[PDB]
């Protein structure tokens, strides 16, 4: 088992396996299971064998019932742990999540304003009030903002004659505004009549190719926290409303744009995305990075022709969902409520930080202790219900640096801070006792019952010279 | 619409001569005038486009000129194959409109038509009806007039005429004239005559016969 | 090596319609407009309109807006035009011509003659024309009351070509009439026999009318 | 493994011109000097009134390292009428794509707009220029009469190009037919013979072109990328093209017959929005004379040990088989967001081992996004899945990423040293670099230990001095070397021998060399190319029984052989390198007799 080739040093013995021990001073092959060492005369004090262990630093109980104070909400427990993991060993952490009955909700309404959405505008003239009234029954802190997108205003996605630049629908004829990439119009606010006002004042633009530049707008809405107005410790619902395909990545190469998106905020004085004509459309990989980092839940409200496409996209994006939008947005309110209700009916775990090279296993314990499932998600639960998770972490090889890891439910601010610290050293390694008599008249150091010979000396006790 | 007019509908030229065809538009056409050649068989070729650009494959003899409303196609060192009709066409505005056409014919020494008159065949007279045919052949130029005289009278009612194209070997033309009458009408009269008037002689050439006689 | 091959002559009764074709080769048919032109017998050229083959978009002269409709089959590199509500004024040759650019048309088809009459196919009446009772002699042949064009005429089976003058046909009470003259040496007729060979394919007709007196 | 990275040729262009966006080798037909072609699609030009028309530059090799623009077109915009331009050459990106075949240079401007002759429009049909010797002609196959997005008005013809071995052009235009895309192939003979500057839409006979299809195929981007190779064994190069938005963004690659543009074979991506088809290449990587297909998906996302997705890109390698099928394998990137597979350059046989090789760029990898290029050597089974070399961009920028490796071109021996060389562009720093291939020394090394079995009691050998009591045997070490190409006929080798290598620090070495009385023996050696196996003998022995109570583990004799590279240099300055595939260590083992 743990008597294999190598393993002639305590540290060497530590890495071959997690169940193996070391012995000192034989009061050859000291590295074997701990029971065997006691059988062969290794005393309890002398036996050496670190084991993975957890330290709980913060474990405030989960908050029960509606909390009048935001600071007493506790939706995940524990909240801070230390995990000392021996190489090749695994420790299972128990994580408990519970959604508080009253949690604030930010909703950013991001809308396609190409020409095919003129009807959609006429039917949402009072969505701000309708939506906020329905959301008032579910949360006491609902805020909403608005932004619009069309396309990168460059050839070959727009006509570039003076007439069509000034009015891209001049040929129709119809009153359109010049094509634009992303307009952040209304930051998040509780004033729902203000939402109504700005929607009523909106006018459509146009462009000539079917796929639109929503991905540019999604990125900005997710990253521009201050200007969008995302508040901490609340839900972040980004509602992407379109009836069309989406440009991505190097599609912009046609327009001569070949500098990749940088995932940074670029809203100018007019609150317009200024790099629209400078940076490539974001890739799916890039949008994932920034949506998770900013804890933004994406909701694709798209027409029937586009659902299957955006569902495949939502498969890749954590927490993303899809709703089937009528051609005139007549049912957008129902979509949003359904999405919010599905969200409050689930708990999905998320593990962020220095996780590369780690092994993770997830087991979900829903419906109190009755149901066990090997996912990171508990569904069909009533707000107030508790979802428990068994997370196992394994470090394949020993490392010299600790890892900062965060475990949190998708879409929720509350997080568990986890530090993974390696333990691939022995207690006896520090007591070197250099130039010991035991290693032939000071020709080595007695470390853990074996001699660490000095340069130029060989043998178990360092008794030969070369 | 733009009206295109080629003043001269026909001109005559000898081999090696320089031919200039004129075309005028009712408005400024900004040099979008093209010249086409149509040969007697109906074939149509593009010669010149944008006033003065040679189309691929047509010879250097052809060249184009003009601006505004007045334009001209020039043929230098005319060839035997050049004999054709030439049209001019504006392409500055729809609808595309053509000129009337200018016909370029070879020049020849004046010649006199060989005239022959033929009475109705016996086959035809059993069918009822009687055609008297007169052939004027190999004469230059094309201008010609024919008159049918019976017993000192002109009918000018049942006559039908046909013209041949200019012959390739010799530049003369030919003319066929047929007068058709009913058998009873044919049987009533005795003399039948075919009178040709050509530029070459002031005295009309005449060819006639008498039905009763032989 | 651009070639536009147009379909054959069309015959139709008044009020009916015809559809003629125009197959392109030697260039990418879909990338160039196709124009159509009308030429009445003995008349000039009249522009009907053009079609963008790949898109079906068309523009017409105001004249032919209700008369003609242009279409195109990209898979076969063929353009079609259909003339509807036919009359005698629609009788003419109809050309197709590709678009050079610069408002010019670089390659033209051979033309499709369209004839609009009520007459039905009719066999000819071939009449020998001998002179009346002296170095050269002119004989004749009259082909009358046949429909439709074409007829083919030869003398002694095409052996006699020089000295022959076959004239174009003429309409005559809604039927075609044609005549031809042959001129030979006085000493070679009637000593040798001269025959007018006429053929009207539309009627499976073939007459060989000798001339005797 | 044999590319010279210590001293490459470094060329620069005007700042902000994207010098290096496209690169190709230029070889005149008269066996004259060879040059480098470099596209600078944003370079300003002397053309009257044209801003950033771009240009293509010819660059001397080593004579000076100077680059001079090629005059394809010295004029500004033609006029349809006064103050009514016919075309728009500013920002046309001339030199976005450049290809060369013997005397011919094809360079294209995929953002050249034009007006059309009817309405006042501005349609990016794209244009190209073809220069043979003196003769230069414009080639705008998409500047047709099929106008607007419906037709070829937004075709951007020239977005990608390549030559066939039979002097046909293959041209891609991703915008035709509402961004369905389109491939067009024309004979260079037609392109020049039919050229007429008075005709804007030229009728080329024998043109091949994909046709407009149902609207479901809109926004597919056929012609985003192109390569050429034979795939039905009729000797006629066929057309390969990337279609990265097809299959609802899974991506596809189309192969059409190079004789009639008939559809032959299809590939399809596995992941949404991986941009499968951004790049494509055709080269026989395993030596069966059947062209193989490489397809890049630079945004492909792999799954990690932690189960997290990470965009690293992916390349697919499809070996062609006589049966017409394909044998496909994938090859994932190494760094996140580095876009491994953005560019794929056939290299020829870089190491001259009998199999073609290939470079794959990760233009946004490395430190400070300086870019990385990976060299993959071929072998009979397919492509060696481990890169034998890694080229690292050395320059940083302050506006747009350096993009080292965004363009590459190889398979040309520019220094006539017998090994193909590689061009790498870095348009974000307006730089293009040439790497020359070092010649490869293959080495056959032998090690013989006789006797193999060793008995302690047996002592007929004598130690230096009067000890005269040791058990002994001998070691015979030999090296042989040869190569291909420009090389000297003499090489200095450094050989090292080590007895009982298995024992490590703190463990007794049972075997020692006779003379030195130590287990390490070093030796300089000289060997001539193509020479016979030059050997050398020496003698060793064993310690006394008392000194080691380990008679079980076998004694291993280890031989290591390295080279002195500077001494083998050439007029080029190009030192040879040992073949990495041949291990430069060999070991034999001897055992102790037991009684
Ligand atoms: C677009 O162009 C295509 C190529 O020009 C064309 O495909 C061709 O189609 C015709 C008729 O449909 C075929 O001719 C027919 O062949 C069959 C039997 O063919 C078999 O034998 C030939 C002869 O082999 C020799 O040539 C090959 C060159 O390819 C050499 O390597 C070989 O050593 C011999 O010297 C062989 O070429 C055929 O191979 C083709 O097909 C097989 C089977 O699919 C493939 O494995 C192979 O890769 C290649 O594609 C085949 O083994 C015969 O019965 C008929 O009577 C007729 O003679 C051509 O072979 C075929 N050529 C191809 C496919 O390369 C497309 O039809 C055309 N499309 C359009 C719309 O125009
Ligand atoms: C590699 O992948 C590509 C991309 O999918 C394939 O290319 C497609 O192939 C299909 C099948 O050949 C093509 O679809 C066909 O289009 C033909 C053209 O239609 C004409 O008529 C319609 C009338 O509605 C017009 O709209 C159209 O513009 C054309 O004018 C159809 O005639 C075909 O119909 C035939 O097959 C269908 C199959 O369902 C039957 O229902 C029909 O009755 C009829 O028998 C067919 O629909 C498609 O256009 C191609 N796309 C492109 C972009 O080229 C390759 O085939 C594939 N190759 C390989 C080897 O896998
Ligand atoms: C080629 O020459 C052109 C001029 O002929 C250069 O363009 C000009 O220079 C810069 C572009 O980098 C522009 O100045 C900038 O203007 C913007 C907008 O006004 C402003 O935000 C910046 O702070 C800076 O002032 C200038 O407008 C531009 N003029 C044009 C494009 O007409 C170009 O840089 C040269 N390129 C190369 C590669 O040499
Ligand atoms: O979004 C906007 O601003 C704008 C718009 C403008 C006015 C009114 C509504 C929408 N879209 C942008 C894309 C455009 O779609 C056009 C898609 C049409 C489908 C289509 C037809 C013909 C063809 C093809 N395909 N393929 C093959 C060739 C022929 C309309
Ligand atoms: C010390 C502090 O800031 N407390 C706040 C206070 O607003 C609130 O009343 C209290 C109730 O637990 O918790 C929180
Ligand atoms: C919460 O907001 C505060 C400022 O109000 C900010 O400092 C902090 O970073 C936010 N939370 C996180 C996790 O960053
Ligand atoms: Ca709508
Ligand atoms: Ca769009
Ligand atoms: Ca082939
Ligand atoms: Ca191969
Ligand atoms: Ca190789
Ligand atoms: Ca070289
Ligand atoms: Mg739209």
CATH of residue A385's domain is: 2.60.40.1510
Give B-chain residues touching D196 at CB under 8 angstroms. Answer: 56
Q: How far is D205 from chain C (nearest CA, A)?
A: 5
Q: Do A458 and D400 touch (CB under 8 A)?
A: no
Phi-psi region of B80 (alpha: psi -120 to 50; beta: other; left: phi over 0): alpha
For chain B, what is the HEC assignment?
A: CCCEECCCCEEEECCCCCEEEEEEECCCCCCCEEEEEECCCCCEEEEEECCCEECCCCCCCEEEEEECCEEEEEECCCCHHHCCEEEEEECCCCCCEECCCEEEEECCCCECCEEEEECCCHHHHHCCCEEEEEEEEEEECCCCEEEEECCCCECCCCEEEEECCCCCCCCCEEEEEEEEECHHHHHHCCEEEEEEEECCEEEEEEEEEECCCC
Q: List, in order of start, the domains of chain C with CATH numbers.
A: 3-116 (2.60.40.10), 125-211 (2.60.40.10)
Pocket of ligand 1 (CB under 6 A): D 232-234, 257, 259-260, 262, 324
Give B-chain residues touching D198 at CB under 8 angstroms. Answer: 49-50, 53
Which chain C residue has its CA at the smallest distance from B58's CA?
A: C106
The answer to whether A351 and A420 are in contact (CB under 8 A) is no
Question: Which contiguous run of DSSP H or E holds residue A186?
Answer: strand A182-189
CA-based max dimension of chain B? 70
Cα–ligand 12 centroid distance for D411 (angstroms):
9
Which residue among D263, D264, D277, D326 has the greatest number of ligand 2 atoms within 8 angstroms of its CB, and so is best to mutate? Answer: D263
Pairing of strands B4-5, B19-25: antiparallel
Domain residue spans in chain D?
27-143+155-192, 441-592
b/e per residue, D210-236, with b = 16+ CB within 10 A?
bebeeeebbbbbbbbbbbbbbbbeeeb
| Beta strand spans in A226-338 (E) | 235-242, 297-302, 321-324
| Beta strand spans in D17-154 (E) | 22-26, 35-40, 55-60, 67-69, 79-81, 84-85, 87-88, 97-101, 104-109, 113-114, 127-131, 136-139
CA–CA separation, D383 and D328 (whole Å) = 11
CA–CA separation, B87 and D409 (whole Å) = 56
| Domain D441-592, classified CATH 2.60.40.1460, yes or no | yes
Return the residue in C26, C50, C101 with the most chain D beta carbons within 10 A, the one to mutate for interface testing. C101
Resolution of the experimental structure, in angstroms: 2.6
Q: Do D198 and B50 touch (CB under 8 A)?
A: yes
The answer to whether A160 and D122 are in contact (CB under 8 A) is yes
Cα–ligand 7 centroid distance for A244 (angstroms):
10
Helix A214-223 / helix A284-293 crossing angle, nearest 10 deg:
20
Please name the residue whose Cα sits nearest to atom 19 of ligand 4: D215
Among candidate residues A344, A364, A385, the one where a domain is terminated: A344
Chains that touch D (3 or more CB pairs under 8 A): A, B, C
Query: How does DSSP assign A74-109, residue by residue?
Result: --EE--EEEEEE-TT-EEEEEEEEE--SS--EEEEE
Cβ(D581) – ligand 2 distance below 6 Å: no
Pair (A279, A136) in one structural domain: yes
Method: X-ray
b/e per residue, D103-118, with b = 16+ CB within 10 A?
ebbbbbbbbbbbbbbe
Pocket of ligand 4 (CB under 6 A): A 114-116, 206-210; D 150, 177-178, 180, 212, 215, 218
Pair (A222, A235) in one structural domain: yes
Pair (A127, A31) in one structural domain: no
CATH code for residues D27-143+155-192: 2.130.10.130
Pair (A459, A338) in one structural domain: no
Q: Which atom of ligand 3 is closest in space to residue D17's alpha carbon?
A: 38
Phi-psi region of D390 (alpha: psi -120 to 50; beta: other; left: phi over 0): beta
Retrieve residue D201's tokens.
């839409």
Which chain A residue has its CA at the smallest distance from D177's CA?
A: A209
Q: Is A209 annotated as a binding residue?
A: yes
Residues in chain B: 214
Question: Which contiguous run of DSSP H or E holds residue D252?
Answer: strand D252-256
Smallest CA-to-CA distance from C194 within C149, C140, C132 is with C140
Pair (A261, A410) in one structural domain: no
Pair (A166, A195) in one structural domain: yes
Which residue among D166, D233, D236 has the greatest number of ligand 1 atoms within 8 angstroms of its CB, and so is best to mutate? Answer: D233
Cβ(D217) – ligand 2 distance below 6 Å: yes
Smallest CA-to-CA distance from D433 within D408, D400, D402 is with D408
Pocket of ligand 5 (CB under 6 A): A 69, 71-72
Pair (A224, A335) in one structural domain: yes
Residues in chain D: 595
Q: Which class for D531: exposed (0-12), middle (13-18), buried (19 or more C-beta within 10 A)?
A: middle
Please name the residue whose Cα sits nearest to atom 7 of ligand 3: D51
CATH of residue A218's domain is: 3.40.50.410
Among D122, D298, D301, beta carbon nearest to A161: D122
Pair (A387, A460) in one structural domain: no
Q: Cα(first)–Cα(last) distance of chain C, in Å?
A: 54
Cα–ligand 12 centroid distance for D33 (angstroms):
14
Pair (A327, A310) in one structural domain: yes
CATH of residue A439's domain is: 2.10.25.10
Pair (A151, A4) in one structural domain: no
Which chain A residue has its CA at the smallest distance from D547's CA?
A: A464
Q: Tokens 């036996």 label which residue?
A: A47
Q: Do A161 and D121 touch (CB under 8 A)?
A: yes
Q: Which class for A260: exposed (0-12), middle (13-18), buried (19 or more C-beta within 10 A)?
A: buried
Q: Do C110 and B42 touch (CB under 8 A)?
A: yes
Among D150, D198, D207, beta carbon nearest to C55: D150
Residues of the binding site of D for Ca(2+): 230, 232, 234, 236, 238, 284, 286, 288, 290, 292, 349, 351, 353, 355, 357, 413, 415, 417, 419, 421
A67 CB-near residues (< 8 Å, 6+ apart) = A73, A100, A102
Q: Which atom of ligand 2 is closest in space to residue D210's alpha carbon?
A: 54
Among candidate residues A299, A327, A344, the one where a domain is terminated: A344
Pairing of strands D9-12, D431-435: antiparallel
Q: Is A327 annotated as a binding residue?
A: yes
Return the residue in D78, D125, D145, D171 with the most chain C beta carbons within 10 A, the one to mutate for interface testing. D145
Q: Is A207 annotated as a binding residue?
A: yes
Q: Tokens 């920034």 label which residue?
A: A290
> D451 preceded by cis ω (within 30°)?
yes
Q: Do C55 and D146 touch (CB under 8 A)?
A: yes
Q: List, in order of start, the domains of chain B with CATH numbers.
A: 4-106 (2.60.40.10), 114-210 (2.60.40.10)
Q: Do C106 and D203 touch (CB under 8 A)?
A: yes
Retrieve residue A110's tokens.
């991001």
Q: How far is C42 from chain D (nearest CA, A)?
A: 33
Pocket of ligand 3 (CB under 6 A): D 14, 16-17, 42-44, 51-52
Pair (A148, A216) in one structural domain: yes
Query: How does DSSP assign A340-364, residue by residue?
Result: HHHHHT-EEEEEEES-TT-EEEEEE
Among C1, C26, C31, beta carbon nearest to D145: C31
Pairing of strands D440-450, D577-578: parallel
Which residue among A69, A73, A74, A233 has the greatest number of ligand 5 atoms within 8 angstroms of its CB, and so is best to mutate? Answer: A69
Q: How far is D128 from chain B (nearest CA, A)?
A: 22
The answer to whether A369 and A386 are in contact (CB under 8 A) is no
Question: Which contiguous run of DSSP H or E holds residue A222?
Answer: helix A214-223
D201 touches chain B (CB under 8 A): no
Cα–ligand 12 centroid distance for D436 (angstroms):
5
Smallest CA-to-CA distance from B114 within B200, B190, B209, B180 is with B200
Pair (A156, A248) in one structural domain: yes
Number of domains in chain A: 4
CA–CA separation, D456 and D468 (whole Å) = 14
Question: Which contiguous run of DSSP H or E holds residue C68?
Answer: strand C68-73
Q: How far is B42 from chain D (nearest CA, A)?
A: 24
Q: Tokens 């049972």 label which residue?
A: D510
Q: What is the DSSP letter of A178?
A: P
Q: Is A245 annotated as a binding residue?
A: no
Structural domain boundaries enclosing A69: 53-100+349-422
Q: Which class for A137: exposed (0-12), middle (13-18), buried (19 or more C-beta within 10 A)?
A: exposed
């Amino acid at each position: 088992g743990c008597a294999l080739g190598g393993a002639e040093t305590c540290e060497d013995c530590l890495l071959i396996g997690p169940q193996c021990a070391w012995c000192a001073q034989e009061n050859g092959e000291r590295c074997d299971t701990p029971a065997n060492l006691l059988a062969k005369g290794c005393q309890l004090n002398f036996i050496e064998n670190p084991v993975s262990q957890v330290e709980i630093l913060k474990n405030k109980p989960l908050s029960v019932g509606r909390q009048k104070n935001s600071s007493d909400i506790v939706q995940i427990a524990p909240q801070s742990l230390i995990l000392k993991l021996r190489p090749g060993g695994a420790q299972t952490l128990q994580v408990h999540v519970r959604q508080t009955e009253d949690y604030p909700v930010d909703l950013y309404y991001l809308m396609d304003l190409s020409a095919s959405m003129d009807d959609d505008l006429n039917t949402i003239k009072e969505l701000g009030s309708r939506l906020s009234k329905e959301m008032s029954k579910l949360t006491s802190n609902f805020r909403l903002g608005f932004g619009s997108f069309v396309e990168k205003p460059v050839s070959p996605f727009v006509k570039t004659t003076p007439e069509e630049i000034a009015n891209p629908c001049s040929s129709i004829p119809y009153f359109c505004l010049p094509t634009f990439g992303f307009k952040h119009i209304l930051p998040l606010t509780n004033d729902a009549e203000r939402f109504n006002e700005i929607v009523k004042n909106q006018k459509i633009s146009a462009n000539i190719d079917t796929p639109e530049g929503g991905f540019d707008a999604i990125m900005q809405a997710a990253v521009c926290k201050e200007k969008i107005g995302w508040r901490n410790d609340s839900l972040h619902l980004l509602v992407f409303v379109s009836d069309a395909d989406s440009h991505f990545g190097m599609d912009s190469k046609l327009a001569g744009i070949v500098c990749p998106n940088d995932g940074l905020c670029h809203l100018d004085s007019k609150n317009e995305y200024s790099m629209s004509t400078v940076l490539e459309y974001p890739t799916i990989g890039q949008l994932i990075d920034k949506l998770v980092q900013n804890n933004v839940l994406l909701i694709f409200a798209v027409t029937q022709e586009q659902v299957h496409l955006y569902e495949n996209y939502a498969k890749l994006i954590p927490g993303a969902t899809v709703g089937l939008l009528q051609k005139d947005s007549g049912n957008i309110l129902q979509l949003i409520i359904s999405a919010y209700e599905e969200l409050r009916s689930e708990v999905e775990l998320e593990v962020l930080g220095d996780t590369e090279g780690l092994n993770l296993s997830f087991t979900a314990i829903c419906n109190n202790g009755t149901l066990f499932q090997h996912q990171k998600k508990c569904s069909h639960m009533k707000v107030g219900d508790t979802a428990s998770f068994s997370v196992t972490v394994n470090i394949p090889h020993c490392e010299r640096r600790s890892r900062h890891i965060i475990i949190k439910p998708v879409g929720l601010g509350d997080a568990l801070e986890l530090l993974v610290s390696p333990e691939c050293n022995c207690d006896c390694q520090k007591e070197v006792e250099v130039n010991s008599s035991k290693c032939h008249h000071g020709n080595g150091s007695f470390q853990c019952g074996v001699c660490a010979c000095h340069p130029g000396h060989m043998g178990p006790r360092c008794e030969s010279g070369h | 619409d733009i009206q295109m007019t080629q003043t001269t509908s026909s001109l005559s030229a000898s081999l090696g001569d320089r031919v200039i065809i004129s075309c005028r538009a009712s408005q400024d056409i900004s040099n979008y005038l093209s010249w086409y050649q149509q040969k007697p068989d109906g074939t149509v070729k593009l010669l010149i486009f944008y006033t003065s650009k040679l189309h691929s494959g047509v010879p250097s003899r052809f060249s184009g000129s003009g601006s505004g409303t007045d334009y001209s196609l020039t043929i230098s060192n005319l060839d035997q194959e050049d004999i054709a009709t030439y049209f001019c066409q504006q392409g500055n505005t729809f609808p595309y409109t053509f000129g009337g056409g200018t016909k370029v014919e070879m020049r020849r020494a004046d010649a006199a038509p060989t005239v022959s008159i033929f009475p109705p065949s016996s086959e035809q007279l059993t069918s009822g009806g009687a055609s008297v045919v007169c052939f004027l052949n190999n004469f230059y130029p094309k201008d010609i007039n024919v008159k049918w005289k019976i017993d000192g009278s002109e009918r000018q009612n049942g006559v039908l005429n046909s013209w041949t194209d200019q012959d390739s070997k010799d530049s003369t033309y030919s003319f066929s004239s047929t007068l058709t009458l009913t058998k009873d009408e044919y049987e009533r009269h005795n003399s039948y005559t075919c009178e040709a008037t050509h530029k070459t002689s002031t005295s009309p050439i005449v060819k006639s016969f008498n039905r009763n006689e032989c | 090596q651009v070639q536009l091959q147009q379909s054959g002559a069309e015959l139709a009764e008044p009020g009916a319609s015809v559809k003629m074709s125009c197959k392109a080769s030697g260039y990418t048919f879909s990338s160039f407009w196709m124009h159509w032109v009308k030429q009445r017998p003995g008349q000039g050229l009249e522009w009907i309109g053009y079609i963008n083959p790949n898109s079906g978009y068309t523009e017409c002269n105001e004249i032919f807006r209700d008369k003609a409709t242009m279409t195109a089959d990209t898979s076969s590199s063929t353009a079609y035009m259909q003339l509807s509500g036919l009359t005698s004024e629609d009788s003419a040759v109809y050309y197709c011509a590709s678009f050079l650019g610069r408002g010019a048309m670089d390659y033209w088809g051979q033309g499709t003659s369209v004839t609009v009459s009520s007459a039905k196919t009719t066999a000819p009446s071939v009449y020998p024309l001998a002179p009346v009772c002296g170095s050269s002699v002119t004989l004749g042949c009259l082909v009358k009351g046949y429909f439709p064009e074409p007829v083919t005429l030869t003398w002694n089976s095409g052996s006699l070509s020089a000295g022959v003058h076959t004239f174009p046909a003429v309409l005559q009470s809604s039927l075609y009439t044609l005549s031809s003259s042959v001129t030979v040496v006085a000493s070679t007729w009637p000593s040798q026999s001269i025959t007018c060979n006429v053929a009207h394919p539309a009627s499976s007709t073939k007459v060989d009318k000798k001339i005797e007196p | 493994f044999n590319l010279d990275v210590d001293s490459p040729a470094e060329y620069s262009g005007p700042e902000g011109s994207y010098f290096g966006f496209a690169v190709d080798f230029f070889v005149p037909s008269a066996s004259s000097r060879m040059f480098l072609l470099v596209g600078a699609p944003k370079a300003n030009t002397t053309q009257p009134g044209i801003v950033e028309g771009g240009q293509v530059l010819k660059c001397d090799w080593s004579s000076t390292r100077r680059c001079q623009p090629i005059e394809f077109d010295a004029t500004g915009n033609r006029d349809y009428a006064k103050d009514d331009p016919l075309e728009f050459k500013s920002h046309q990106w001339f030199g976005a794509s450049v290809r060369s075949k013997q005397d011919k240079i094809l360079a294209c401007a995929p953002l050249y707009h034009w007006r059309t002759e009817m309405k006042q429009e501005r349609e990016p049909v794209g244009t190209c220029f073809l220069q043979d010797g003196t003769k230069t002609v414009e080639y705008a196959p998409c500047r047709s009469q099929d106008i607007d997005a419906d037709g070829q008005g937004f075709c951007q013809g020239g977005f990608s190009i390549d030559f066939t071995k039979a002097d046909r052009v293959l041209l891609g235009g991703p915008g035709s037919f509402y961004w369905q895309g389109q491939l067009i192939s024309d004979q260079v003979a037609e392109i020049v013979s039919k050229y007429d500057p008075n005709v804007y839409s030229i009728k080329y006979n024998n043109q091949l072109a994909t046709r407009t299809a149902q609207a479901i195929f809109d926004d597919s981007y056929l012609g985003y990328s192109v390569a050429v190779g034979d795939f039905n064994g009729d000797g006629i190069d066929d057309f390969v093209s990337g279609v990265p938005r097809a299959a609802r963004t899974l991506g596809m690659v189309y192969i059409y017959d190079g004789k009639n543009m008939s559809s032959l074979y299809n590939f399809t991506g596995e992941q949404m929005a991986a941009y499968f088809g951004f790049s494509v290449a055709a080269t026989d990587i395993n030596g069966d004379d059947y062209a193989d297909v490489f397809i890049g998906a630079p945004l492909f996302m792999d799954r990690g040990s932690d189960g997290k997705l990470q965009e690293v890109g992916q390349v697919s390698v499809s070996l062609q088989r006589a049966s017409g099928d394909f044998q496909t394998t994938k090859l994932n990137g190494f760094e996140v967001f580095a876009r491994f597979g953005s560019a794929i350059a056939p290299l020829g046989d870089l190491d001259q081992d009998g199999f073609n090789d290939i470079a794959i760029a990760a233009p946004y990898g490395g430190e400070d996004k300086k870019g990385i290029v990976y060299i993959f050597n071929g072998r009979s089974t397919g492509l060696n899945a481990v890169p034998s070399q890694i080229l690292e961009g050395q320059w940083a920028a302050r506006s747009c990423p350096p993009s080292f490796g965004y363009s590459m071109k190889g398979a040309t021996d520019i220094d006539k040293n017998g090994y193909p060389d590689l061009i790498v562009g870095a348009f974000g720093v307006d730089r293009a670099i040439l790497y020359r291939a070092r010649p490869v020394i293959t080495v056959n090394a032998g090690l013989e230990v006789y006797p193999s079995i060793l008995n302690q009691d047996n002592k007929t050998c004598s130690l230096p001095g009067t000890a005269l009591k040791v058990s002994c045997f001998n070691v015979r070490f030999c090296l042989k070397a040869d190569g291909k190409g420009v090389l000297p006929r003499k090489l200095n080798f450094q050989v090292e021998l080590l007895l009982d290598k298995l024992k490590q620090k703190g463990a007794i070495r049972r075997a020692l060399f006779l003379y030195s009385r130590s287990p390490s023996h070093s030796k300089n050696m000289t060997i001539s190319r193509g020479g016979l196996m030059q050997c050398e003998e020496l003698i060793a022995y064993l310690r006394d029984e008392s000194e080691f109570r380990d008679k079980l583990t076998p004694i291993t004799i280890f031989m290591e052989y390295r080279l002195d590279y500077r001494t083998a240099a050439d007029t080029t300055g190009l030192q040879p390198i040992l073949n990495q595939f041949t291990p430069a260590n060999i070991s034999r083992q001897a055992h102790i007799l037991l009684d």
